[PDB]
Design a protein around this ligand. Structure first.
Ligand code: NI
Length: 341
């Protein structure tokens, strides 16, 4: 049974609600982004209208085989009428194709559902500037002040400088980057650009990247592993055993691996600056964990919410424990008293 925080009152609509069977009353199912916790339940046998971005629609058709007749793509930043209700899709600054949804209810209530997002000051100059929001359905993944991490630009700078130094010292080093979902593509694209290489990967991953509308993608990626000195591998293989096994397969072309694991936040963020990050090393293999986040930090979240001034907040992450729920409610009240709304 579908939980309350996935239903939009006063509508026939649900958000990210495909794992509950046929939801009673639902005439349109919205999907914010193509991550498995959110699409859980969709397949080629789905027969209800799905509303989403163009990029999400490419992935539903090619990767999950949903039939074309049930995929409804909408442009961003554009007022659209769906089943008699005005909606707008906004870029979420999450993974490719990820959106927030603004719903203009027939009674005059305005609701924003963030999906998953990384709040940014640029959002304060979207179509959100123009009007009031009564209810905010909020991605609260990192809603606690311990959750700190650097900008995505600082992280990429570290990765580019690290890879370029290592391969200039040893032209026989291979770079490997882990992946397990869409998102975080800048990590491997930026490193391959500094090295003058295409990114090599499996046919399955190549297929996924070809759905993302990235400009000039055919110039940037390949399935010919022998021609590339940046390889992608599943995240589960980014360990000393898996990397050893990979280096064997490269026919004596390489004598060293430098690997990256993009994570979210980890507790070593509570001690170490990005500049001071060091790898784990065994013999001719080194592994960097780098804190490349596609979710808001606590301070980014707080800023966004204090600017929007919603009347009510409904968390969509960390909702399963009383301790989490109580912690989040406390910070919402602090934020409101401090800003005066
Ligand atoms: Ni996500």
């Amino acid at each position: 049974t579908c939980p309350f925080y996935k239903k939009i009152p006063g509508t026939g609509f649900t958000v990210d609600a495909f794992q509950y069977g046929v939801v009673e009353g639902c005439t349109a199912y919205f999907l914010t982004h193509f991550h498995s916790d959110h699409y859980a339940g969709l397949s080629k046998h789905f027969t209800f209208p799905v509303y989403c971005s163009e990029i999400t629609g490419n992935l539903l058709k090619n990767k999950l085989h949903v039939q074309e007749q049930y995929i409804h793509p909408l442009p961003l930043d554009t007022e659209c009428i769906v089943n008699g209700v005005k909606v707008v899709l906004l870029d979420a600054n999450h993974c490719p194709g990820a959106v927030m949804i603004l719903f203009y209810l027939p009674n005059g209530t305005v609701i924003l559902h963030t999906g998953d997002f990384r709040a940014d000051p640029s959002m304060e100059r979207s179509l959100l500037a123009d009007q009031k929001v009564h209810m905010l359905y909020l991605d609260t993944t990192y809603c606690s002040p311990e959750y700190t991490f650097p900008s995505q630009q600082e992280v990429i700078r570290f990765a580019i400088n690290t890879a370029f130094e290592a391969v200039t010292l040893n032209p026989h080093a291979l770079v490997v980057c882990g992946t397990y979902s869409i998102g975080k593509e800048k990590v491997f694209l930026a490193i391959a650009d500094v090295l003058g290489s295409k990114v090599g990967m499996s046919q399955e991953k190549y297929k996924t990247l070809q759905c993302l509308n990235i400009p000039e993608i055919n110039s940037l990626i390949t399935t010919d592993m022998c021609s590339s000195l940046v390889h992608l591998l599943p995240m589960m293989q980014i360990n000393f055993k898996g990397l050893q096994s990979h280096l064997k397969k490269c026919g004596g072309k390489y004598n060293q691996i430098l690997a990256f694991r993009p994570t979210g936040w980890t507790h070593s963020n509570k001690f170490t600056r990005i500049a001071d990050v060091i790898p784990q090393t065994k013999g001719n293999i080194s592994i960097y964990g780098i804190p490349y986040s596609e979710h808001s930090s606590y301070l980014e979240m707080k800023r966004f919410v204090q600017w929007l001034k919603p009347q009510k907040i409904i968390p969509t992450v960390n909702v399963g424990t009383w301790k989490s729920r109580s912690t989040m409610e406390k910070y919402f009240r602090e934020w409101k008293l401090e800003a005066g709304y």
